[PDB]
Design an enzyme around this catalytic site. Sequence first.
Site, short mmCIF file in Angstrom:
data_model
loop_
_atom_site.label_atom_id
_atom_site.label_comp_id
_atom_site.label_asym_id
_atom_site.label_seq_id
_atom_site.Cartn_x
_atom_site.Cartn_y
_atom_site.Cartn_z
N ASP A 118 -92.99 18.68 24.73
CA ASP A 118 -92.65 19.11 23.37
C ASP A 118 -92.82 17.98 22.36
OD1 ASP A 118 -92.02 21.22 21.56
OD2 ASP A 118 -89.83 20.97 21.79
N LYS A 168 -93.89 16.41 19.20
CA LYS A 168 -94.12 16.83 17.83
C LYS A 168 -93.34 15.89 16.91
CE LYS A 168 -90.67 20.58 18.13
NZ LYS A 168 -90.38 21.97 17.68
N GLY A 214 -83.50 23.49 15.50
CA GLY A 214 -84.68 23.82 16.28
C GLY A 214 -84.50 25.18 16.94
N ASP A 248 -85.43 15.13 22.54
CA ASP A 248 -85.51 16.48 23.08
C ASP A 248 -86.26 16.52 24.42
OD1 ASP A 248 -85.39 19.38 23.30
OD2 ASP A 248 -85.10 19.42 21.10
#
Length: 294
Positions: A149, A151, A33, A167
């Site tokens: 975040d 996703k 990432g 995350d």
Amino acid sequence: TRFHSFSFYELKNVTNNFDERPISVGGNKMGEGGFGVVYKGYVNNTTVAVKKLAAMVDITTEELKQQFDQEIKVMAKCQHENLVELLGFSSDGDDLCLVYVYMPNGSLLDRLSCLDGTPPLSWHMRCKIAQGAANGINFLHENHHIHRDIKSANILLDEAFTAKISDFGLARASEKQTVMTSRIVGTTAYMAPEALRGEITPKSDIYSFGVVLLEIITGLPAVDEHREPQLLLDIKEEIEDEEKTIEDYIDKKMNDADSTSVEAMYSVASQCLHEKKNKRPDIKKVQQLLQEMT
Ligand SMILES: CC(C)Nc1cc(Nc2nc3ccnn3cc2F)ncc1C(=O)NC[C@@H](F)C(C)(C)O
């Protein structure tokens, strides 16, 4: 304290000196990432995922340290079947490592794209994953945390395809609740319009989840530079303008999708994707609608 403190050398030892070759070819690399690379390892017979933080995006060493500390704080407070589990960390020297339980089916992003030859996910598995992901977000919001975040790359899958949110480096705790930031962070293809400006609200997590529901229905990534349209949320406009239907975008890599449940998931996604933050449903309503769907 709740997590094991590892020495950096120990994690260098168990990941074969952070072998950059993919796991599919016998290496240790599983993914990457903007804030680090993830390696497979074995610690005391336990398969682990080791995230080595060294930055590949425009971020400072002190900002990396803040995200490392934030992840540990959120993980110490939040434990749930739909959240990844932190086993430990390394902080000795200029290197920062987070150690987790290894996820046998990796990320939802990789499984939707059949990366490394995995079979396509059936509609039935996609519905269970969507429900698991909403339960994870619901737990985070109930514990006054905003992910920031969400996703498909951050939705991991265990041996049974149980969705696990990951995350938490950018997660924000909110007692009160819209607030502002000068450092805009996240993945643009998934971000709500207000989050792209710098607003911080749990309603942004709902918008991002709506994008994930569209990736689940279509099997298409949220952004593709070599696709027309490049942005997945543009299909909502094409469908709303009656120029197309959701049936024209259903992933062809499945044989068990039915129009009724597909339309019901699309209805949840469109509600999540309202331009006006206050028109979007709360996570408990999303959770309830996804349960009614099955
Ligand atoms: C780095 C992401 C994409 N891939 C994982 C993350 C994880 N674990 C975690 N990774 C991260 C990264 C950040 N938080 N986090 C939490 C976790 F528990 N475990 C395994 C994979 C992984 O790639 N597994 C292999 C399977 F995909 C297979 C099909 C056999 O190739």
